[PDB]
Enzyme design. Sequence first.
Site, PDB file in Angstrom:
ATOM      1  N   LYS A  17       3.267   6.379   5.611  1.00  0.00           N
ATOM      2  CA  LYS A  17       2.308   5.391   4.809  1.00  0.00           C
ATOM      3  C   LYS A  17       2.876   4.073   4.964  1.00  0.00           C
ATOM      4  CE  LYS A  17      -1.251   3.907   2.447  1.00  0.00           C
ATOM      5  NZ  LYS A  17      -1.371   2.764   3.481  1.00  0.00           N
ATOM      6  N   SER A  18       2.115   3.140   5.591  1.00  0.00           N
ATOM      7  CA  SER A  18       2.397   1.828   5.740  1.00  0.00           C
ATOM      8  C   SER A  18       1.963   0.774   4.691  1.00  0.00           C
ATOM      9  CB  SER A  18       1.939   1.253   7.241  1.00  0.00           C
ATOM     10  OG  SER A  18       0.407   1.528   7.217  1.00  0.00           O
ATOM     11  N   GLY A  19       2.520  -0.328   4.852  1.00  0.00           N
ATOM     12  CA  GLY A  19       2.186  -1.396   3.616  1.00  0.00           C
ATOM     13  C   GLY A  19       2.291  -2.575   4.320  1.00  0.00           C
ATOM     14  N   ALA A  20       1.114  -3.631   3.952  1.00  0.00           N
ATOM     15  CA  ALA A  20       1.258  -4.915   4.437  1.00  0.00           C
ATOM     16  C   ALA A  20       0.832  -5.838   3.007  1.00  0.00           C
ATOM     17  CB  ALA A  20       0.095  -5.307   5.355  1.00  0.00           C
ATOM     18  N   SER A  34       0.848  -1.039  -0.129  1.00  0.00           N
ATOM     19  CA  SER A  34      -0.132   0.125   0.043  1.00  0.00           C
ATOM     20  C   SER A  34       0.752   1.135   0.203  1.00  0.00           C
ATOM     21  CB  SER A  34      -0.902  -0.027   1.119  1.00  0.00           C
ATOM     22  OG  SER A  34      -2.124  -0.696   1.112  1.00  0.00           O
ATOM     23  N   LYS A  92       0.359   3.932  -2.552  1.00  0.00           N
ATOM     24  CA  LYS A  92      -0.831   4.922  -2.822  1.00  0.00           C
ATOM     25  C   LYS A  92      -0.407   6.319  -2.542  1.00  0.00           C
ATOM     26  CE  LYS A  92      -3.465   1.649  -0.583  1.00  0.00           C
ATOM     27  NZ  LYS A  92      -4.355   0.365  -0.843  1.00  0.00           N
ATOM     28  N   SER A 117      -5.773   3.621   3.772  1.00  0.00           N
ATOM     29  CA  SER A 117      -4.932   2.598   3.004  1.00  0.00           C
ATOM     30  C   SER A 117      -6.142   1.767   2.165  1.00  0.00           C
ATOM     31  CB  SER A 117      -4.390   1.540   3.679  1.00  0.00           C
ATOM     32  OG  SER A 117      -3.371   1.030   2.925  1.00  0.00           O
ATOM     33  N   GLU A 136      -5.221  -3.511  -6.882  1.00  0.00           N
ATOM     34  CA  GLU A 136      -5.706  -4.044  -5.552  1.00  0.00           C
ATOM     35  C   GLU A 136      -6.525  -5.048  -5.659  1.00  0.00           C
ATOM     36  OE1 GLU A 136      -4.421  -3.787  -2.595  1.00  0.00           O
ATOM     37  OE2 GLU A 136      -2.990  -1.907  -2.508  1.00  0.00           O
TER      38      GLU A 136
END
Length: 263
Positions: A209-212, A45, A48, A105, A141
């Site tokens: 901004k995080s992402g998994a 993510s 983004k 997200s 996505e």
Amino acid sequence: HPETLVKVKDAEDQLGARVGYIELDLNSGKILESFRPEERFPMMSTFKVLLCGAVLSRVDAGQEQLGRRIHYSQNDLVEYSPVTEKHLTDGMTVRELCSAAITMSDNTAANLLLTTIGGPKELTAFLHNMGDHVTRLDRWEPELGEAIPNDERDTTMPAAMATTLRKLLTGELLTLASRQQLIDWMEADKVAGPLLRSALPAGWFIADKSGAGERGSRGIIAALGPDGKPSRIVVIYTTGSQATMDERNRQIAEIGASLIKHW
């Protein structure tokens, strides 16, 4: 700092997985610390932010308007659409979509925005025109977070992402109203709580901004600093681990704790 690097290496051991890490001076752009700066990891993510950067670039060029309102269908919704689920009848503005993509997200929100610019191929084109010949988005996505080993689709390098986030936040690429809007959205990040934010004292600035992803993929990008102003960019990525979400979180937070302790 050498001790933050030590903690990074320890994070690999605990997760049984590669970890990418870079630390940039926001002003000079000079590299202050790095580990696997030039290996590839799934963006997740994390893209983004790059996306909304492309959208803002167009707003600046008269090719888009933050106020433009977009309508969509039940058939457009994908997995994890916390805010888009709630606006089937009334739709959402480009502004609200970018807020939802970065801040929550929200997946459908990101897709809608990709449509806006002509899909993944156009994001990748935008990146390329600003001198990032490494970062690349290929799918939509939720399938962009599959992280098949050795698969270079939907990946960046810590060094690239960071250099790129800096150009977006700091450079002449966006107008200052747009630079401000981008960072304002990141600062308002409503997830990412368990990450770098949990090691941040009051008074420090952080926009992030995080992402998994699949296969233990996890990551974060951020501009942060003491005294309510940002002064460094930090990029962190891991993929491969079999560890809990909580466990991958913890290793992230602890890297931040070192970064801060040894500022």
